[PDB]
Design an enzyme around this catalytic site. Structure first.
Site, PDB file in Angstrom:
ATOM      1  N   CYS A 134       0.951  -1.404  -0.101  1.00 51.15           N
ATOM      2  CA  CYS A 134       0.150   0.045   0.034  1.00 51.15           C
ATOM      3  C   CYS A 134       0.550   1.360   0.184  1.00 51.15           C
ATOM      4  O   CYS A 134       1.711   1.408  -0.992  1.00 51.15           O
ATOM      5  CB  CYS A 134      -0.862  -0.064   1.144  1.00 51.15           C
ATOM      6  N   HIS A 178      -3.978  -4.788  -0.415  1.00 47.98           N
ATOM      7  CA  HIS A 178      -3.222  -5.464   0.968  1.00 47.98           C
ATOM      8  C   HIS A 178      -3.488  -6.731   0.714  1.00 47.98           C
ATOM      9  O   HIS A 178      -4.605  -7.489   0.797  1.00 47.98           O
ATOM     10  CB  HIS A 178      -4.306  -4.987   2.017  1.00 47.98           C
ATOM     11  N   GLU A 214      -2.574  -9.189   3.073  1.00 44.66           N
ATOM     12  CA  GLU A 214      -3.075  -9.912   4.302  1.00 44.66           C
ATOM     13  C   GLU A 214      -4.476  -9.720   4.301  1.00 44.66           C
ATOM     14  O   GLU A 214      -5.307 -10.404   5.369  1.00 44.66           O
ATOM     15  CB  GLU A 214      -2.879  -8.836   5.479  1.00 44.66           C
TER      16      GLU A 214
END
EC number: 4.3.2.10
Lengths: 200, 252
Positions: free
Chosen positions: A84, A178, A180
């Site tokens: 990001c 992202h 994750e």
């Protein structure tokens, strides 16, 4: 595999750390450390993460004297990976913080996107030139990279705007989304980074 | 283009998943972290934990849920239900939540929206809107559907986007507890009034209800009811919608 995640901010970094710990569980001799200071030895994988203002975080990296470190990893051809905000920092400057410039590891700039709904937010589809799996990843960002084709790695469209969601200048990697928060393919991608960053 | 999302709603009380309708027969349906992992495992796009813990222990219990979720989950989650002021939302976001959902506290103080958005960005702020038909008008209710606020849904949705909300969570009070399908007319109604992503809530029962919700203009469709107790296979549903034109998020 000696993995480093810059932990200074801004934003949540424990998601990525936890996602990186998850993706690395099936690899021999993994260590993941949260880096706030310069260390004497270098990492195989250094992640630059972050969510926020381009100017800050270019502040938090110079304040804690990590540009030196980061650039050493580049020269010592380690793997340097931004996510990001961290990916945007890899370029020269940004419209988000005018006079402020940063890292300049890759030739380019960061600009606000052209959409009137401009927290670009949700699952959008990344298509890669190579290596990393194609599919839908989770974005939350207002600024995009402007760079020249050869440094593009993955391309996604948001509201008629094709833009680089992933970049690569050798062993520098950057991802706008992202991973994750990207579920199965987010772990698949992270493992591919760890793999790339193995052999040298 | 951006994918239409399928979202799992986990109702949680005392750090536990609750199943039932009235709390006479509210029974334990398990661990929210394990259950949320299962939703991710099967392909659910976002999660939403709504907490109905008693007022005394609500703030502490909600922070424990976020941390326990934040330490194991790999998809965006929203936490909401009883969040009445900025710093309560600050706590929750810094503890791990991606988005915080507000309703009562946002109607009683539109400013609260812009607070969270200013410090955390619009993407952090989901506004829940409970709306019902009252004398031919779409009205906003608060206190869990029990107080008529005298605010038209039509005016509220505009104000809500005006305050910097990132996402609307639209529940039709006439359709909760129902399995006949989403309130598509209300979704149609809201759709021209905002550019925020709309999350349809209340009424789902079969695959085709999601197709109806997305046809009506929802950006995502929430649902508790169905996914556990393997009624609707999530991937089944995602293929079904793909087939009939919805841009879902599909995994090979």
């Amino acid at each position: 595999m000696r993995i480093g995640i810059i932990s200074v901010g801004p934003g949540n970094i424990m998601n990525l750390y936890r996602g990186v710990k998850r993706a690395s569980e099936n690899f021999e001799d993994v260590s993941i450390e949260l880096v706030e200071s310069p260390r004497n030895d270098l990492y195989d994988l250094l992640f630059i993460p972050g969510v926020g203002h381009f100017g800050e975080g270019m502040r938090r990296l110079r304040e804690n004297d990590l540009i030196d470190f980061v650039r050493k990893h580049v020269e010592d051809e380690r793997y340097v990976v931004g996510v990001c905000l961290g990916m945007q920092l890899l370029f020269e400057e940004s419209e988000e913080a005018p006079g402020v410039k940063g890292l300049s590891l890759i030739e380019g700039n960061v600009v606000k996107l052209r959409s009137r709904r401009l927290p670009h937010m949700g699952w959008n589809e990344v298509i890669f030139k190579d290596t990393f799996p194609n599919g839908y990843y989770y974005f939350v960002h207002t600024y995009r990279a402007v760079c020249e084709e050869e440094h593009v790695l993955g391309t996604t469209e948001y509201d008629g705007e094709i833009f680089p969601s992933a970049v690569r200048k050798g062993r520098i990697l950057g991802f706008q989304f992202h991973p994750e928060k990207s579920s199965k393919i987010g772990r698949k991608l992270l493992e591919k980074v760890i793999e790339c960053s193995l052999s040298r | 283009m951006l994918a239409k999302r399928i979202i799992a709603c986990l109702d949680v009380k005392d750090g536990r998943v609750v199943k039932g309708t009235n709390f006479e027969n509210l029974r334990d349906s398990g661990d929210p972290v394990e259950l949320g992992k299962f939703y991710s495992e099967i392909g659910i796009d976002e999660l939403v934990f709504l907490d109905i813990t008693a007022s005394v222990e609500k703030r502490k219990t909600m922070l424990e849920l976020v941390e326990k979720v934040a330490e194991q989950i790999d998809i965006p989650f929203t936490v909401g239900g009883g969040i009445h002021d900025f710093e309560t939302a600050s706590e929750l976001i810094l503890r791990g939540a991606d988005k915080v959902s507000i309703n009562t506290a946002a109607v009683e103080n539109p400013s609260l929206i812009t607070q969270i958005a200013q410090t955390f960005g619009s993407q952090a702020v989901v506004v829940a809107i409970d709306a019902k038909r009252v004398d031919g008008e779409f009205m906003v209710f608060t206190y869990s559907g029990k107080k008529n606020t005298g605010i038209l849904l039509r005016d509220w949705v505009v104000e809500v986007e005006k305050r910097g909300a990132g996402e609307i969570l639209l529940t039709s009070i006439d359709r909760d507890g129902t399995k006949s399908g989403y309130d598509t007319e209300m979704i149609r109604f809201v759709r021209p009034l905002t550019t925020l992503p709309i999350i349809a809530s209340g009424g789902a029962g079969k695959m085709e209800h999601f197709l109806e919700a997305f046809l009506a203009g929802a950006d995502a469709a929430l649902a508790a009811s169905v996914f556990h107790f393997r009624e609707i296979d999530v991937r089944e549903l995602k293929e079904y919608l793909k087939k009939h034109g919805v841009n879902v998020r599909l995994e090979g």
